[PDB]
Here is the input.
Amino acid sequence: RDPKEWIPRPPEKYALSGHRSPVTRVIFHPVFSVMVSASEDATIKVWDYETGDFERTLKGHTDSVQDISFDHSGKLLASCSADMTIKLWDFQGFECIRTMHGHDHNVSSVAIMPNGDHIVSASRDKTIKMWEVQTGYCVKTFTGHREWVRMVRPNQDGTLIASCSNDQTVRVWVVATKECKAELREHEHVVECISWAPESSYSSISEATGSETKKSGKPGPFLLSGSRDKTIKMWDVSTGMCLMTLVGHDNWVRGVLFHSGGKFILSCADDKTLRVWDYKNKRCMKTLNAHEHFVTSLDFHKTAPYVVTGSVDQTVKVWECR
Amino acid sequence: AQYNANHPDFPMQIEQLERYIQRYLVYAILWSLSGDSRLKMRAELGEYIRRITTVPLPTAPNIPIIDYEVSISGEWSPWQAKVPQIEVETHKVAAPDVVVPTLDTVRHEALLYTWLAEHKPLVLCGPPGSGKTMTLFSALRALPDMEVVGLNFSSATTPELLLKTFDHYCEYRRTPNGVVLAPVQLGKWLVLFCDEINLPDMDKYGTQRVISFIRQMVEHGGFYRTSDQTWVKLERIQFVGACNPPTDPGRKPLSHRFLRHVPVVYVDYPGPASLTQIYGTFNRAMLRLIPSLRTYAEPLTAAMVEFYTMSQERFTQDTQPHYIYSPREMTRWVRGIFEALRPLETLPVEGLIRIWAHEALRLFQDRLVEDEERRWTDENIDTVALKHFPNIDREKAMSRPILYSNWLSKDYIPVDQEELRDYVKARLKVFYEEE
Amino acid sequence: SGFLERMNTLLANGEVPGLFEGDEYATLMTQCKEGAQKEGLMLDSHEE
Amino acid sequence: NSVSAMKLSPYYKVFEEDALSWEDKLNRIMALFDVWIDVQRRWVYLEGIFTGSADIKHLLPVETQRFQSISTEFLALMKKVSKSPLVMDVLNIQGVQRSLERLADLLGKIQKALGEYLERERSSFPRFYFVGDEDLLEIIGNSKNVAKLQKHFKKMFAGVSSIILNEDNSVVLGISSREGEEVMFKTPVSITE
Amino acid sequence: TDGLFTHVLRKIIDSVRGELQKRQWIVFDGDVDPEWVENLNSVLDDNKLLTLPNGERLSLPPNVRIMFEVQDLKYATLATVSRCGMVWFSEDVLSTD
Ligand SMILES: Nc1ncnc2c1ncn2[C@@H]1O[C@H](COP(=O)(O)OP(=O)(O)O)[C@@H](O)[C@H]1O
Here is the structure.
């Protein structure tokens, strides 16, 4: 097992199935060896991926839960549901310590800042809102999108937050001054998912795309935007140019992310497959028939060689990597 | 005069001028007295001229004179020498721009160029899809000093439709001789292409206002500005018309007073031989994507031509108004197959037939009204395919639920009904909570 | 019937000559410049 | 000034038409060339930025392509001026007036879009921090033409009003102050190397 | 972005249309208070420089003269008075005749 090169394999490890509704998203706990998944039955079930044993359900949401996230310490879980509410969970006690209102429609994303003192969320009211962890007050609103904003994700340092909306555009914002750094629009259809480039991949991205080394030394933040036109595009936030376009998915791309080692791209779509991409050569090695229905999301563990993929068939699967 | 310009050292001599004019005059008479008639009538006029004239004529026993142009040297030369068997590039197969040369095409393009060079108004008459718009646009490519503007006439068309175009593409300027209308640009002649001139309805007294308006602009070189009752003179403006035959439903015959200024050229439907040549070239270029399928170009073209012929005669405007079939359908037929073959790196012969059959249904069956016609199309598609493509898997290519979609794959591939139903049901669930 | 007339020209040509006049035509030229710059090409004349 | 004296002349009445005609041409010459000299100057020190810098294309891709579109049409306009360099013909150019106004506007838009490039360029030479953006663009753009750089050394040095160069203007021989005092470099600096 | 006085001085310094070869005079016709006139301390001193917040420094050409036309100096500080040569125009200079 190469410590930065493992990829998932067709033989699944565990097939966890307790949800009564399609699984929306699946995430890994940064510290503990435990798994958290959110579904459309207003439940957030927590699983252990080493033994595949269900532990507990985090209920309290009225309607379907759309996104969940963890802070850096793993002590807080931020969940957003379609009931216009954002709930903050004390993970040690497994209770809802704060409920956040203010969105005028369905909330489809949520994330905790790397500093851990602020929460960013995006909803169907065409706004991206920011909240305080301590007080639960809305402090900033990022307007400018013309349609439903589906996902919002911050960069490594938390200074920039990216958002993808139904307006077929991907916008990068500056948290400090709320300005739109760039408007990345090349997808011909609605963009579903976004993902940033980890620090271990800037050199690989620069040498793979043929981009010359910059005098500053920083190649610039790189963004991925999977959309429903069955294409995956990698962008240069600094320059606003689409570095490459990945083709090969048979349906709408629902999730995309980098390998922890920054060597491959993992992406799941509605074609019932999970695909591993080589951005070095702009081609796909392995296609995994993950589920019997649409694949809603995927996540890649930072250290352990495990991949989790949610699906509409109400099944959460854990993949060994070899 | 152009010949003398090209030959400054050797001006054209009288005996060459005498020969050239005499051949041209006979060539001019045939195209001026029978250009608005069928091919049979054109041949009949040529026979009558041959029986009475003394000008030297082509010696071909059966080729009509209309197939011979007049060379600048002063000798008859067949039109067949200017229609070479070209090879279209694969990426421009059945494109709107590309025109396959044909005997009728070159004759009309030269005739269209002659009238257009004089800025003389002209009207192309023929059934829809026969090539009236194409031939004119092809001729305008030989005249870089002209800009074409497309106007579509309807039953409610009235002269202000021409007026609003004038403000957009021309400007009114004050001159000492009066108000003169000219295009905003300089040096190019504006050509107003009126696609359906004969639909504008007559009043109860049998007069079309726009036709009289066009007649006024061409005979008197201008019109009247109704805002200030000021005469306006047209400059660098040309009129070109297109229309279906007046006997077609909804069409009205044009006024005789309008017809004197406007020669009419008849563009009939291409014959089976012409259609085979035109779409055989398209098929050969299109089928170069799959080298293993290049041997099927001829049977594919014959099948496309044959089924188009049977469909055209079976369904006519008598039953339903929209039962109009033209080469446009076959152009869409080639486009449909070419798009379905671009992403595929290989395909068996049965797969090509399935795509060929799929496009036939989407073009000739979607507009049929009752089930009897649809069943007729289904049966005859199989018979045509079997007749031109023997010894192939019938069931593999003629599976009745012929469904093609790019929903379940990155490319346009056949999709089974059951998987398609499941996917649409899953999509509908998302469609409910989104839209 | 005028509803169909505008539709008839729009279908075949993709543009209605008698739609944008006066300020509307002047206004249209603004985002036409703005739209062209966004997609990359630079155009200045009203005809292009 | 000469024609204005004709305006007060009592005999101007028999030459109202022609003298007034020259005023229309003379004033239009002034209007055409007042923007021309500026537009020419901007293009001179903007092309040096976009040609002498290799990293500007990757760091500033969107507006670099815009400059080449501006540059080529400026070259196209200047080329046909070279074809007919008569003052009346270039004045009688179809749309010569508006063509320079968009040139002034487009070059201005490009110039305002270089702010972050010049700020980073100041790190290479520390003394560039005491030079305005307009002057710094002139300094970097006109590096090849060192003749016009003599007016900027006073803003970067305490007493170096101007430098002393060889006939080829390729090797720095010394420096000069505002009073004419000169310092002869022991080892002259070559710009070619 | 340059102000009114800076733009006038910068054009003279640039001398695109031969400004330096002329006699340029800048007259400040109005009231003088330390809010704006103290910004000319370096201009009116031996430095002869107009220092801007952006770090740009504009040397005063030898052919330009800074002029003030004022009716009173009840608000001007000692720094402004000491940096300029005073020419007193009593009302008796311009008689009724
Ligand atoms: N020689 C030819 N080469 C290529 N295409 C042809 C040829 N003859 C006919 N066609 C097809 O016939 C169609 C003519 O349609 P069009 O000219 O638009 O009809 P109309 O002039 O009645 O509107 C075109 O789409 C063209 O593809």
The CA atoms of residues 145 and 406 of chain B lie 44 Å apart. The pocket of adenosine-5'-diphosphate is lined by residues B 99-100, 102, 105, 128-134, 242, 270, 278, 327-328, 331 (CB under 6 Å). The first helix of chain B runs from residue 2 to 6. The longest strand of chain B covers residues 237-243.
